Design an enzyme around this catalytic site. Structure first.
Site, mmCIF file in Angstrom:
data_model
loop_
_atom_site.group_PDB
_atom_site.id
_atom_site.type_symbol
_atom_site.label_atom_id
_atom_site.label_comp_id
_atom_site.label_asym_id
_atom_site.label_seq_id
_atom_site.Cartn_x
_atom_site.Cartn_y
_atom_site.Cartn_z
ATOM 1 N N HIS A 110 25.591 12.560 35.099
ATOM 2 C CA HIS A 110 24.155 12.250 34.835
ATOM 3 C C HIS A 110 23.311 12.357 36.109
ATOM 4 O O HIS A 110 22.602 11.401 36.459
ATOM 5 C CB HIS A 110 24.009 10.876 34.194
ATOM 6 C CG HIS A 110 24.466 10.836 32.783
ATOM 7 N ND1 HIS A 110 25.679 10.317 32.430
ATOM 8 C CD2 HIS A 110 23.851 11.216 31.642
ATOM 9 C CE1 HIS A 110 25.811 10.379 31.122
ATOM 10 N NE2 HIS A 110 24.691 10.915 30.610
ATOM 11 N N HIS A 161 22.288 17.992 35.761
ATOM 12 C CA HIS A 161 22.155 17.730 34.303
ATOM 13 C C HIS A 161 20.675 17.847 33.906
ATOM 14 O O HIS A 161 20.358 18.566 32.978
ATOM 15 C CB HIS A 161 22.758 16.354 33.953
ATOM 16 C CG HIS A 161 22.502 15.919 32.555
ATOM 17 N ND1 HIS A 161 23.008 16.595 31.468
ATOM 18 C CD2 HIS A 161 21.821 14.858 32.067
ATOM 19 C CE1 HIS A 161 22.622 15.988 30.366
ATOM 20 N NE2 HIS A 161 21.879 14.921 30.707
ATOM 21 N N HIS A 211 14.564 12.799 31.872
ATOM 22 C CA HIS A 211 15.164 12.048 30.733
ATOM 23 C C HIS A 211 16.273 11.096 31.185
ATOM 24 O O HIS A 211 16.648 10.229 30.379
ATOM 25 C CB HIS A 211 15.666 12.991 29.631
ATOM 26 C CG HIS A 211 17.030 13.521 29.863
ATOM 27 N ND1 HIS A 211 17.245 14.562 30.702
ATOM 28 C CD2 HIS A 211 18.230 13.170 29.343
ATOM 29 C CE1 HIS A 211 18.553 14.802 30.760
ATOM 30 N NE2 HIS A 211 19.187 13.952 29.931
ATOM 31 N N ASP A 212 16.821 11.258 32.389
ATOM 32 C CA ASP A 212 17.967 10.443 32.876
ATOM 33 C C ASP A 212 17.681 9.874 34.289
ATOM 34 O O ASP A 212 18.629 9.409 34.954
ATOM 35 C CB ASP A 212 19.245 11.269 32.774
ATOM 36 C CG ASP A 212 20.031 11.108 31.476
ATOM 37 O OD1 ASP A 212 19.891 10.078 30.788
ATOM 38 O OD2 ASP A 212 20.812 12.017 31.181
ATOM 39 N N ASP A 234 20.121 17.785 25.487
ATOM 40 C CA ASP A 234 20.966 16.809 26.205
ATOM 41 C C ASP A 234 22.448 17.111 25.965
ATOM 42 O O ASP A 234 23.269 16.845 26.870
ATOM 43 C CB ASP A 234 20.600 15.394 25.768
ATOM 44 C CG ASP A 234 21.007 14.321 26.753
ATOM 45 O OD1 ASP A 234 21.050 14.608 27.963
ATOM 46 O OD2 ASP A 234 21.287 13.213 26.304
ATOM 47 N N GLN A 245 37.447 15.291 21.815
ATOM 48 C CA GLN A 245 36.415 16.365 21.810
ATOM 49 C C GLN A 245 36.203 16.877 20.377
ATOM 50 O O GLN A 245 35.030 17.006 19.927
ATOM 51 C CB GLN A 245 36.824 17.514 22.740
ATOM 52 C CG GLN A 245 36.700 17.183 24.224
ATOM 53 C CD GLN A 245 35.255 16.942 24.581
ATOM 54 O OE1 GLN A 245 34.442 17.860 24.583
ATOM 55 N NE2 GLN A 245 34.899 15.686 24.797
#
Ligand code: IVY
Ligand code: MG
Ligand code: ZN
Length: 311
Positions: free
Chosen positions: A67, A71, A105-106, A216, A268
């Site tokens: 993050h 990213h 956004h992060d 995202d 996953q």
């Protein structure tokens, strides 16, 4: 009259959904500015204010495995690809606001879920009951906009400025994966019963929310070697949080337990089936030119099935 250009390979590759931004951090600001200019023109921002904003945003991203600043710019590139392939669908304000939302956004992520903040009893969890980190990221965005020389929206009227910050707020809140499930189910139904209307602001907000989820999660839509190496960063964070859970005296979920590394490929599959394929499926129904994301996601699911079978 001061355009931005990229070397030939990047100039071509950057128009594609599966573009990887490369290991040269010092090129990422130039890539972002290039994307803003082709997405809403050279005029929409003062170049010296925009560059000042980008460097302050970079400074406020931390050195966490996943993050991080890389990213932020990856997520902004995916939004750029969605906007360029659906040119006539979005307004000048939405185009300007959504690339900025993706970059911010992060902001100030420490590599922990909202759930760990709640269990640690972090002050941000008292300040914000739901979407703890996402309300914090938006606060950080407003802080950087209010620094001397950083107001990139200076030529917007008060009406326009409030509209663009409300787009950014909702775009950033929507990156809370807990909100994605309800939002996608409601979009699926509006589509199937033919009621989805892009003139209804309420439906528009939901559609932008799904775009933000898609951007995202976009590491799952890269070519296999990029997807496989990004998963190493994602799990480095998850296992660190697992370790911090064990220090609070709480058994972490298996995904976050570094003693259950063996379960990763099967985990996953779960994620692709439960989250990623449903996300790009519903997004392609509403925005047909985003098909390549769904194609690449399916490709990577089939690669994880090969890993489970020892191929
Ligand atoms: O590889 C993955 C495996 C698990 N999860 C995941 C994450 C939260 C909740 C859950 C839930 F519990 F809801 F299933 C599953 N996500 C990923 C993944 C892929 C791309 N981004 N991304 C990702 C990483 C960090 C935070 C959110 C993300 F989305
Ligand atoms: Mg986030
Ligand atoms: Zn993110």
């Amino acid at each position: 009259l001061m355009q931005f250009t990229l070397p030939v390979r990047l100039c071509k590759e950057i128009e594609l959904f599966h573009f990887d931004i490369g290991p040269f951090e010092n090129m990422w600001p130039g890539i972002f500015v290039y994307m803003v200019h082709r997405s809403c023109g050279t005029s929409c921002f003062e170049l010296e204010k925009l560059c000042r904003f980008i460097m302050s945003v970079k400074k406020n991203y931390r050195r966490v495995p996943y993050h991080n600043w890389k990213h932020a710019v990856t997520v902004a590139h995916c939004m750029y690809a969605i906007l360029q392939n659906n040119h006539t669908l979005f307004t000048d304000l939405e185009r300007k606001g959504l690339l900025i939302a993706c970059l911010c956004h992060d902001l100030d992520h420490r590599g922990f879920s909202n759930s760990y903040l709640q269990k640690f009893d972090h002050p941000l969890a008292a300040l914000y009951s739901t979407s703890t980190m996402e309300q914090h990221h938006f606060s950080q965005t407003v802080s950087i906009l209010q620094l001397e020389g950083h107001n990139i929206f200076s030529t917007l009227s008060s009406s326009e400025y409030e509209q663009v910050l409300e787009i950014i707020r909702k775009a950033i809140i929507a990156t809370d994966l807990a909100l994605y499930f309800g939002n996608r189910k409601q979009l699926e139904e509006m589509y199937q019963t033919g009621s989805l209307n892009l003139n209804n602001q309420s439906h528009r907000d939901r559609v932008i929310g799904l775009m933000m989820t898609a951007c995202d999660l976009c590491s799952v839509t890269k070519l296999w070697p990029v997807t496989k190496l990004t998963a190493n960063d994602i799990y480095a964070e998850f296992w660190a949080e697992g370790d911090e859970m064990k220090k609070l005296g709480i058994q972490p979920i298996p995904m976050m337990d570094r003693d259950k590394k063996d379960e990763v490929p099967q985990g996953q599959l779960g994620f692709y089936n439960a989250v990623a394929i449903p996300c790009y499926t519903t997004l392609t129904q509403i925005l047909p030119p985003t098909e390549p994301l769904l194609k690449a996601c399916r490709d990577n699911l089939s690669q994880w099935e090969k890993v489970i079978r020892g191929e």
